[PDB]
């Protein structure tokens, strides 16, 4: 506690666990936010800076080896550089003795004492404190209970599903009672007839049994994928209508992966806490004969269930853990086949194909490792529950033959108490094997469920730019001060030689992010209060990256605006300079394009972008380097696109090509993350400030 | 028709199976490989080809609507278009009535109407058709008698497992008629001491039975995962050394889901053939003596066995069809999840997020359709063996009744049979489930095979090319023609407009392949008798597509050469230029970099390849247009790469940017897959020819 999802998040693991013994259990996606979580982990200013965001006084300070401090605040965060991965941060809660206990994020809580330790640390600390506010935790909401909500409308189904179990469990028991008039009375007294019927009507009773399994089973199936796919369709929908900054923070593997993980665990919570109430009923039923059958022999039965549960139970927490384990490994072996066949032809080059082979050898043999250790703890379990089950077995035969022979009961009895056990002890079993199922539904539940608590959005002409600051990250911000002012219908330039923040600005005008501190303004009005839908279909963003859906061409370049003129379209094809390459397709229009296939070019596919840009019909056109993704067809592309905006919509170019954004109107300069001066070429190049700087260092040779 | 492995080859499944049916057994891999099989598909002209290179006499020509000839030549191809993907091909061996019968290559032979054919077919047609030579194709060798070669250094293992086994079952029996014991003497004839005795041994008995399945389970585990291990370790080696166009040819996703699932499920045959020597033996015995025990109800449990068998192996065939459906299926909604989640941005800007919502949903929803589909099948299957088996029971326990009252047996010796049932149908019960397992583990065995086959390579100064052609795939080739000439220790250039040839000249210059026409010339021999090991050496390459595999820097940029010297370690960093951003790291030279991770931007990894390319000291030099892809980093390190030059060895420039490449000594210029002229940018530029008018394009 508090265990990571992912390997993103840590020291967002590490602030939660701490905040949760401090008295605060929140969200570990909201810190993720706070503590700006990125790709490449949490950094040390983001856990202070969400420290005191929460309002606690917190020091981060670098380390001696061996500090051992005697008034040493508890607890502490040290960063561990040589731990498999990167982002991994370490909880320090207890140094006694000649022992650092290291109270690990990853669900784990080691002793690798101070000779491990200083072995494996950064010495990066991080001391944390209490500021007033909040001094609260309650804000993690149960999800399951809006899950449960889910399992509310098919009340009429699992109610069918629960008297077909009551049922066929009757039944169960009415054809277990057969081998007792078997034994006792068929055979002792050799009825022929008798026999013949009573086993006919007992084998009718089977077959009732099955016929209602049959629908039993098919009921439960149809119940548990719909709460599958409605689940899947929310979480699906909810980050669809989610905002930037998350998807950014975190990988398509995360969300892909958790998304289905989390959906199936939470339906085999639903369908088990559909097992609970049937099972239980069924257990106290049996239960209950089998203590009128016989009261020894039941708690003897009572004795063989406690054994099981105590093995089960004592067995469930490490098998968890060699399953992540093997989740974890196996994984990295993957992931570095992948990264290995995706630079077979640099590593062919080398000539060190040995190596990576090797590599993978290791790979192969750790996952080989874990597998094993997985697997013993699996056998062990079975050895011992079966070692249980089968003593069980032999004792309730052998006492049986004593209260038999006793006088106390019949063979007969005994063989129909045989077959009762299999009515007590299957309900039990099944309901003391449902812990685990929920523990790791719980984990589940909560990985669904707060990125279904994260808001979205909303809530939470002339083109001017007024004191505007912006940082993507909780770093150093990448755009300080801004000023700036763009006339309507001209063509303008965007320069600077950090094209993270050249397409920065423009990003941050289609909204996707907003200001740190003032606000941004066009044609008059902030951008704060106009409507994000229009944003996105007015103004058109041609990528440096383009990026194709797989699917018809013909329906690749019209998302967004359905029903679109062909003649509208078109012209943009034609005018995209690609409609050459869009007419020599074999299936025209309609032919299928799937992952940049069958045969797609880089300089088609931009082309095809800026046909996209076309037919959304921009009043604002904002273009990336996109040119330099192939240089002369664009050049073509490029004059024949210029050619058609007629200067009749607002066009802003980011580009680094000085030559290419001299003919330009209008030119901006970005230093240092400050806009220094605006201007021409020729006025820039007179002004002798930085530009004619640039233009000497430019014609430097 | 012959099921496809994977997606790429699915013509080459066809002309196996008209091959196969024809007498002509070949490895598909080989097929693929004749067909062109490209990540694209394979080409109808690639299908043309592959007959010929078989030997067949076939015209491929294009076809009507309901021409309903007579005599149309059987069989044949013809290609369907719709409608779910576009690399469908399948094949035509019986077209009759009405009822036009298609061979589908997804393991399939339906009898689709040509109302619905009709609705969804190109029409597209090739007449297949025995031309001279050879036919023959004995080539197909079972490869699990290679696979079963594994298990002879495990044969001590083996004899292990199956000793214990057969221990365990003896005692099994033993423990099995303690029943009889308990109802026909210590019940009945009432004696306390002998059963508080008798009941402890059997006890024992159960407790050795359990410490002998402990050791035994361990073993065949340990058995499995070795298995794995070496198979998975064998195609993976040789995978790496396979020559490119494979690698071409097929995805990643293809040769690594075929490497981890292909293996295991072939590891899961040799375990396989444990339960078929154990269980063989174990039933017999267990056989016998329930004959022995009572005839009717041997014969009896004979027919249950039957009935189980019956219905199991009636089940097998459409259980795996609608595995594969799930597969494919499952497979299209993650394909469609991933791609909707690359494109977020794009897909916020066009505001179609319902769109591709609905569509994912649609995908999910015909997901849920294939999954219910085999969970039906899987529910019918439990329900009618568990008919069989409960039946078996109630009816084995009756007429066992009426034995016991006819007088052939007691009621403790029912009990004894009862109970000694289960160690003569389990065994047979797993012998006969192993089969369809077994048929998995064959295709499997053929899906890792086919790329074990493939064979490796070897077999299969100034620098001049001479007529020399080269095409990647059967498709309009990258090069017709290409004449050149290089100077030994000079800086020299390469321009065109197609950036694809550019690199494909260097590609091939690094002879990663073979001129099909012609040959290529390095210093007075041709590349295809120089050693590929020093063409590997002494030729680095700087590529648009800069490659970190994941780990440290210091071993990351030293790959290829080992027990290099960190000076010149720090002195290619210092070249590099990078070697400042380098020393900013946290952890110096040795900062994991998993994967490319964590913080690494594209200047500083254009120039980590430069490095690399730096270490190796090439004695020819390729150099992609690595600055045309990062602008700023460029200018500065391009005065520092020109200044690092030296003029020591050869250094080749592939670039578009016409104004930055004339500095270098001379230049070649490529149009159209064809050599123009060979020269400085004075004389090309003033000749007025064609690179003029580019230069007028410059502007």
């Known amino acids: 506690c508090v265990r990571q999802y992912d390997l993103t998040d840590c020291g967002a693991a590490c602030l939660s666990s701490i905040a949760q013994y401090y008295g605060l259990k929140m969200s570990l996606a909201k810190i993720r936010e706070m503590t700006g979580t990125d790709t490449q982990g949490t950094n040390a200013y983001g ?24 008034d040493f605040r508890l607890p502490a ?21 000649r022992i650092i206990t290291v109270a690990d994020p990853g669900k784990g809580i080691v002793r690798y004492s101070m000779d491990d330790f200083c072995s494996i640390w950064t010495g990066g600390l991080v001391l944390l404190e209490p500021g007033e506010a909040f001094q609260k935790g309650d804000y993690t909401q149960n999800m399951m209970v809006k899950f449960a909500g889910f399992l509310k409308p098919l009340k009429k189904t699992v109610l069918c599903i ?25 055979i002792k007294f050799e009825k022929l007839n008798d026999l013949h019927i009573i086993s006919a009507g007992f084998a009718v009773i089977f077959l009732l049994q099955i016929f209602l399994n049959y629908y039993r089973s098919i009921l439960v199936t149809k119940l548990g994928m719909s709460i599958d796919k409605s689940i899947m369709m929310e979480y699906y929908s909810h980050v669809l209508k989610l905002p930037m900054n998350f998807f950014n923070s975190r990988k398509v593997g995360e969300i892909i992966s958790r998304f289905m993980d989390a959906s199936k665990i939470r339906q085999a919570i639903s369908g088990a806490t559909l097992t609970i109430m049937i099972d239980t009923i069924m257990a106290v039923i049996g239960g209950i004969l089998l203590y009128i059958q016989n009261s020894s022999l039941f708690f003897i039965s009572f004795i063989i269930i406690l054994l099981y549960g105590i093995i089960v139970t004592v067995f469930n927490k490490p098998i968890q853990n060699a399953n992540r384990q093997i989740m974890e490994d196996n994984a990295k072996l993957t992931s570095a086949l992948v990264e290995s066949v995706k630079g077979i032809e640099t590593i062919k080059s080398f000539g060190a194909e040995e190596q990576t082979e090797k590599s993978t050898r290791d790979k192969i043999e ?8 997985e697997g013993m703890l699996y056998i062990n379990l079975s050895s011992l529950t079966g070692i249980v089950a089968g003593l069980g077995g032999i004792v309730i035969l052998w006492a049986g033959a004593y209260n038999v022979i006793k006088g106390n009961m019949s063979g007969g009895q005994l063989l129909a108490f045989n077959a009762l056990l299999a009515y007590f002890l299957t309900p039990v079993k099944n309901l003391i094997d449902l812990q685990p199922l929920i523990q790791t539904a719980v984990v589940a539940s909560n990985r669904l469920g707060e990125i279904l608590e994260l808001a979205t959005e909303k809530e939470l002409g002339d083109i001017e730019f007024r004191n505007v600051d912006f940082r993507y990250g909780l770093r150093k911000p990448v755009l300080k001060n801004i000023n700036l002012t763009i006339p309507k219908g001209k063509t303008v330039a965007i320069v600077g030689e950090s094209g993270s923040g050249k397409t920065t600005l423009a990003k941050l005008l289609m909204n996707f992010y907003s200001p740190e501190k003032g606000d941004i303004l066009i044609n008059g009005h902030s951008i704060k209060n106009i409507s994000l839908e229009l944003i996105r279909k007015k103004i058109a963003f041609v990528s440096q990256d383009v990026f194709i859906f797989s699917g018809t061409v013909k329906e690749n370049l019209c998302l967004g605006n359905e029903n679109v003129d062909m003649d509208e379209i078109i ?22 394009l799937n992952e940049s296939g069958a045969n797609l070019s880089e300089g088609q596919k931009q082309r095809l972008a800026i046909a996209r840009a076309l037919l959304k019909k921009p009043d604002i056109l904002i273009l990336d380097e996109a040119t330099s993704n192939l240089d002369s067809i664009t050049e073509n592309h490029i004059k024949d696109a210029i050619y058609g905006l007629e200067d009749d919509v607002t066009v802003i170019i980011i580009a680094h090509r000085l030559s290419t954004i001299v003919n330009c109107d209008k030119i901006y300069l970005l230093k240092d993350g400050e806009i220094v001066e605006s201007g021409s070429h020729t006025e820039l190049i007179a002004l002798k400030g930085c530009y004619f700087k640039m233009w000497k260092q430019t014609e430097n040779t």
């Open 571 to 592: 012209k943009a094809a034609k005018m995209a300079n690609a409609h050459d390459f869009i007419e020599k397709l074999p299936l025209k229009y309609d032919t299928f």
């Open 162 to 186: 629960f008297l077909a179990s009551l049922l066929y469990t009757a039944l169960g028991i009415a054809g277990s009672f057969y081998i007792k008039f078997l034994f006792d009375d068929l």
């Open 366 to 373: 750790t996952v080989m490792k874990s597998s094993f250790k």
């Open 77 to 97: 965060i040290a960063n561990v550089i040589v731990d498999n991965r990167l982002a991994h941060f370490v909880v320090i809660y207890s140094i006694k003795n």
């Open 47 to 70: 856990l202070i800076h969400a420290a005191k965001q929460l309002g606690f006084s917190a020091k981060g300070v670098k380390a001696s080896k061996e500090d051992l401090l005697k």
